[PDB]
Every structure is written in C-alpha cells, then in structure tokens.
C-alpha cells in the first residue's frame, strides 16, 4: 500500500496543522491510491486531542465529491504534540472508515495507516 | 464504571512516573471496583513509549494476589509527554484484558478507560478517596 499526495497538497495540510490548536480533519479525495483534492472538514468537538467531523459539512463534501466523480482515497487529521499514528479511538474510526487514514502533526511528521491488522502506508510526495 | 482508588496510592503511582524515563506499568488488585493494593510490574520494553510486562513478574504477581483473595481490578501505566488516553497498542490489550485500564502522566493528569457492551472506548470515572 502507497499513498500518492502531490507535495503542495501535503504542504497546505501541514501549514494549517502548525497554526492549529485543535486537532485538524478533512478528506483527501482523488481515485484509485493518488490523492486529487483536499478538503478540510469543521472539526466539531473543538478539541486538542480527539477530532469528529461536522456531519452537515461532512455530507456536503461528500456530495461534491460524487458531483465530479472523485472517491474518499483517505482519511486526514492531525495530532497536537504526539506522532502520527492512530489512537485507540482512531482504530475505531478505521474500522467505520476503512480508507487510507493519513495523520500529521505541527513537527511536520507525516505517517498513513489502513485497516483486524493495521499496516502503515507509504507516502509517496509528487 | 467508577474507579475507587485511596489517594496515597494514586500519588505514589504518580511520584513514581514523575521520576521515571520510561513507562510504567502494573496491576490494580483489590475487590469490585475498589483498589487495594498496587503492584508495579517490570516494562520489559523499557520504553518511553510503549510498554509491556514481564511475563516473569507478571505471572507472580498474580499468583501473591490469588493468596490474598484479592482480584485484579485494573492495569495502570504511564504515558510521557502525551494525553492519558488510550493507545492503539492500549486498545488491544485493553480487548485481551477488559478490565479497568488507569492511565496517568508526568504532569500529573489521570484518566480511566474501559470496553463499553459495544467493545468501544469509554471513559470510567476515578473517585479519589
Ligand atoms: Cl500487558
Ligand atoms: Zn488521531
Ligand atoms: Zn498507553
């Protein structure tokens, strides 16, 4: 497994991540493993250390998605501090939403993970 | 759930991470949701990041519980410089051992976790008495 992200897509996720002080979510949509379109999700709990999307935003981008034929390649969001590998609570929400999960944090680490055994995927930067 | 912990035992546990470079870990003995008796176990890892027990220790540990009718009520650890919330390694030993899971850390901050009747991750909580 590889995730494909064009460099000034992971670029623009990670600036928005090092100015944030809750955590960040969003999807990156696109086709097959490569990463088209970002999205940046309102993250609803207002939170430092968990995140859930804004369900209204959440289907309103999902929509536009379908509108112009793009799929849910992943899963973004970022840690505050810690690296970027799943939480517990993250382990759940893979098993909900089994696509690419790509998690970064304010350092500029960046690691991706799928789903009951979890592989890191490898972040192939275009 | 509700945790019942006496509160010099949850100061020594949290002296103990304070000095600590790397995690530690151990067993919550005691009756219902009561703690009794504290047991630190070796974090054969000697990790600041992760942790797992001797198997050595552990084994004797809870065979010196069962001679004092004594049940394991949690598993505790620390966490350095991170939220005392569940790892996903902490998920899986939390599936392997669904009882009370204590998490504390070096600012002094600590949190309680349990398997809801769904298997998910709920917080339990900790009345310090
Ligand atoms: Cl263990
Ligand atoms: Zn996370
Ligand atoms: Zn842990």
């Given at each position: 497994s590889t995730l494909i992200i064009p460099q000034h897509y992971l670029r623009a996720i990670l600036k928005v991540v090092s100015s944030s002080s809750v955590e960040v979510c969003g999807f990156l949509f696109g086709?097959?493993?490569?990463?088209?379109?970002?999205?940046?999700?309102?993250?609803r709990l207002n939170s430092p250390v968990e995140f859930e999307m804004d369900p209204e935003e959440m289907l309103k981008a999902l929509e536009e998605a379908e509108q112009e034929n793009l799929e849910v390649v992943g899963i973004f969001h970022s840690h505050i501090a810690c690296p970027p590998i799943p939480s517990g609570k993250d382990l759940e929400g893979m098993k909900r939403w089994?696509?690419?999960?790509?998690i970064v944090n304010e350092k500029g680490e960046y690691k991706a993970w799928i789903l009951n055994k979890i592989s890191e995927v490898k972040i192939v930067v275009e």
């Open positions: 086709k097959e493993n490569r990463v088209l379109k970002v999205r940046f999700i309102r993250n089994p696509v690419i999960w790509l």
